[PDB]
Design a protein around this ligand. Structure first.
Ligand code: IHP
Lengths: 143, 574, 58, 51
């Protein structure tokens, strides 16, 4: 009905929604709210929604909020500013996705050239990666 | 493993008158356990319980009486002594036990609960009332009065339960929730005139100077739920008018619930703006350097067309948050507070003298020696081109060159002087510009471009002649590119030929030799291209064949253009 | 570790054209000044949506 | 920050201009920089400074 013409009132709806929304339903509301702030709002507001989204959405889909935040920061501030939100992810999402984030993070640091940082990503992931079954991780580190 | 647990521990996982005489043995056990260890109160309960189980109620009584001589403050003994009497239907004994318990330990709720409950279950409810009344005479905790209220309500004695509340607030009135619970009770029984009076008395009790938000919110939401919406709105507005905004967050959120339903658009947006202004003002006090709170707050106040003095004042508060760093990175976001302030003062307030003071105050704040923003100097220069004061704009922009030569400052000043049609001025500025960065080959092009744009074909040749003599350009190929382009475009092809070969004295790069031959192709003097290839053949014989192959096949391209069946073998035999 | 090959992306003066010799900065700048003092002077130029709750209110 | 400042300037002045014959003086800098970057992509930590 209004788009951006009532945005400060629109924010109050989304905040009033998310102030009581449970974390099983909040996934769509956060992405809808970020779309508003993306197309009409200030940039750090959209990023703050994603920063909320990757902790307010339940664990079973929290990785799907982190990679949004990764993509959107990377899309505007590049891979250098992207680093700190990988380290949040690796420390927080469950171990199967924490490996996956570690492989993706090490790929960036090698494609940049921070080879010493790349090792510490692998070496930190390697303690939660049983070589008797997770053989594809140890292959990527071996390569 | 071998043994350490799953054997050595596991192997040790495992390895008539005769009734009357049993009674005598049990009392021997119990009574000597007592002699051995009084204060083991569980033995006295078991012994007293056991005499009950044998039906020896009179013995059981004396045992509990002897237990109470050892510890009269044990609530367990009084309750177990009480429960055994009422198990045995000894209601007058049980009543005497409870009267003693509540007499001796009036603060132990368990006796009052169990006693009044027993007297209720036994349907002596005026006996139960007097027990609760006697309890309330000790001014007991809040939880005690609730059980008396609940007692009266379970018999639907609403006016009785009302009287307990009115006594309850004389004792525990300090807890606002007791006051709200009463008004909920009066409301839920439909005594809405009493519920309203209860909230009004609450405000009176806690004091209409030391105003309490929880009463206001509860009272306002009550009137809302009674459809007294103009009173509900009244109570919220009175709250916001009389309380500091570090409280009132509950009053606000509920007011922007009440108004957001029961209000109307002009009211709904008014309260949300006032909420947001309060919200930004808070998160500014939390940090100050939360520039995005300022940029929102300033935008909000501008968007709502708020009065100039207040928009101007908040800008001054924004501006005081100077970054604590000498590094341009932190200023890059900050500086748009200043720019927007000037834009507001020029566009919205339309007070250009004040706008000038904004721009001036930028330049007094930026360090300039460590870094500069060309943004502010360009904007302040163009602000003085507006109002038709180029004599000020030149002074502003010339000091920018003076304090801090920077490429966008030169470019923007030159562009201004071009638009003014002041060709003498920008020529002098280019000379200063090239003196400021003589390696900036791209600017040598734009200086020579100006000379060609003015049509002074002699001026431009001299610039290029000086340019190619300057060592250590950023990228000479781009200068030679422009100069050959110019030397072609003025039809001085004999000088362009001269110019091309006087490049070749400094390079034997394969693609330059290809382009030299390709130049002769575009002249239509393909004989010049041929000996360019023959020169690139019979003088670079030390060049490796895998590099030469790119140039030998460039002549092949020239001869497939030419079609000379005899020339291809000349291309082939090299 | 001497990594950081992202710094290999910027470069300048790839073609061999620069003489790779220069004066001391003051006399170098003086050479530029006194050369550009030779530039000729003369010139010529001419260069001539619907809202019904509100609708029924207003 | 400095690297991207130099990079954007050097990129811009290439894509600024082409030409019909004299363009062979210019390099297609950005692609040569990519070629240089993939050549420099092989790097290793040094060994034997101690043991
Ligand atoms: O001084 P230059 O080397 O010509 O570079 C400037 C300058 O960049 P820096 O001062 O940050 O090095 C400008 O910055 P300001 O002087 O205005 O602070 C910048 O403007 P932004 O900071 O807004 O990016 C502008 O970029 P643009 O051309 O996009 O306005 C860019 O100019 P060039 O791109 O012409 O070099």
């Amino acid at each position: 009905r209004y788009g951006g013409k009532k945005l400060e009132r629109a924010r109050d709806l989304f905040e009033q929604c998310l102030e009581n929304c449970p974390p099983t339903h909040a996934k769509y509301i956060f992405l809808l709210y970020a779309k508003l702030e993306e197309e009409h709002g200030l940039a750090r507001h959209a990023l703050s929604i994603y920063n909320r989204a990757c902790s307010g959405v339940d664990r079973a889909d929290m990785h799907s909020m982190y990679n949004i935040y990764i993509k959107k920061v990377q899309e505007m501030y590049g891979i250098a500013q992207c680093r700190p939100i990988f380290e949040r992810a690796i420390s927080e999402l469950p171990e199967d996705k924490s490996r996956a984030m570690s492989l993706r993070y090490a790929q960036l640091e090698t494609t940049v050239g921070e080879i010493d940082r790349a090792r510490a990503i692998y070496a930190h992931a390697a303690e939660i990666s049983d070589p008797k079954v997770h053989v594809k991780f140890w292959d990527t580190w071996k390569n | 493993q071998i043994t350490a647990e799953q054997l050595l521990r596991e192997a040790k996982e495992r390895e008539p008158d005769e009734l009357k005489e049993y009674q005598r043995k049990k009392r021997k056990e119990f009574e000597d356990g007592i002699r051995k260890n009084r204060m083991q109160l569980a033995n006295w309960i078991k012994y007293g319980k056991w005499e009950e189980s044998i039906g020896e109620i009179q013995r059981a009584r004396s045992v509990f009486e002897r237990a109470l001589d050892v510890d009269h403050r044990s609530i367990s003994i009084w309750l177990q002594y009480a429960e055994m009497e009422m198990r045995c239907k000894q209601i007058n004994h049980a009543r005497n036990v409870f009267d003693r318990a509540i007499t001796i330990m009036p603060r132990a709720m368990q006796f009052w609960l169990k006693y009044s409950y027993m007297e209720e279950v036994i349907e002596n409810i005026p006996g139960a009332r007097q027990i609760f009344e006697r309890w309330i005479e000790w001014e007991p905790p809040e939880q005690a009065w609730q059980t008396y209220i609940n007692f009266e309500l379970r018999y639907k004695e609403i006016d009785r339960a009302r009287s307990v509340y009115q006594r309850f607030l004389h004792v525990h009135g300090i807890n606002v929730q007791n006051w709200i619970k009463y008004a909920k009770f009066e409301e839920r029984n439909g005594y809405i005139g009493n519920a309203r009076a209860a909230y009004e008395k609450a405000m009176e009790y806690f004091g209409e100077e030391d105003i309490n938000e929880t009463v206001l919110v509860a009272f306002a939401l009550f009137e809302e739920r009674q459809k007294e919406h103009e009173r509900a709105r009244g109570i919220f507005k009175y709250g916001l008018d009389n309380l500091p905004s570090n409280r009132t967050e509950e009053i606000f959120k509920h007011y922007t619930q009440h108004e957001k339903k029961f209000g109307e658009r002009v009211g709904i947006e008014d309260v949300i703006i006032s909420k947001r202004k309060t919200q930004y003002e808070k998160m500014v006090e939390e940090n100050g350097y939360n520039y995005d709170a300022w940029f929102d707050y300033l935008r909000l106040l501008e968007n709502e067309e708020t009065d100039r003095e207040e928009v101007e004042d908040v800008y001054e508060r924004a501006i005081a948050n100077i970054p604590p760093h000498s590094e341009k990175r932190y200023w890059r976001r900050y500086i748009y507070l200043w720019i927007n302030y000037a834009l507001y003062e020029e566009l919205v307030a339309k007070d250009f003298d004040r706008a000038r003071q904004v721009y001036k105050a930028c330049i007094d704040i930026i360090p300039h020696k460590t870094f500069t923003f060309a943004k502010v100097w360009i904007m302040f220069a163009h602000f003085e081109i507006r109002q038709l004061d180029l004599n000020a704009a030149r002074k502003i922009m010339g000091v920018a060159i003076g304090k801090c030569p920077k490429d966008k400052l030169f470019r923007a000043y030159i562009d201004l002087e071009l638009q003014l049609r002041e060709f003498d001025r920008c020529r002098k500025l280019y000379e200063k510009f090239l003196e400021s960065s003589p390696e900036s080959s791209q600017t040598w092009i734009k200086f020579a471009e100006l000379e060609t744009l003015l049509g002074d074909t002699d001026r431009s040749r001299a610039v290029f002649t000086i340019a190619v003599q300057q060592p250590a350009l950023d990228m000479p190929e781009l200068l030679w590119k422009a100069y050959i382009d110019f030397e072609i475009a003025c039809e001085e092809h004999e000088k362009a030929r001269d110019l091309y070969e006087t490049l070749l004295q400094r390079t034997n790069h394969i693609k330059v030799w290809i382009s030299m031959a390709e130049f002769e192709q575009t002249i239509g003097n393909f004989e010049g291209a041929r000996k360019a290839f023959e020169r690139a053949n019979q003088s670079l014989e030390n060049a490796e064949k895998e590099e030469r192959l790119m140039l030998l096949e460039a002549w092949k391209e020239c001869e497939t253009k030419s079609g000379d069946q005899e020339a291809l073998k000349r291309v082939e035999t090299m | 570790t001497p990594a950081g090959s992202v710094a290999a992306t910027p470069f300048r003066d790839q073609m061999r054209i620069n003489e790779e010799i220069a004066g001391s900065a003051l006399e170098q700048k003086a050479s530029l000044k006194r050369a550009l003092a030779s530039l000729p002077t003369p010139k010529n130029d001419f260069e001539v949506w619907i809202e019904d709750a509100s609708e029924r209110a207003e | 920050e400095q690297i991207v400042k130099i990079g954007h300037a050097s990129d811009s002045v290439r894509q600024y201009i082409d030409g019909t014959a004299t363009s062979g003086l210019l390099t297609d800098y950005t692609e040569s920089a990519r070629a240089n970057a993939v050549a420099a992509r092989t790097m290793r930590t040094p060994m034997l400074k101690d043991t």
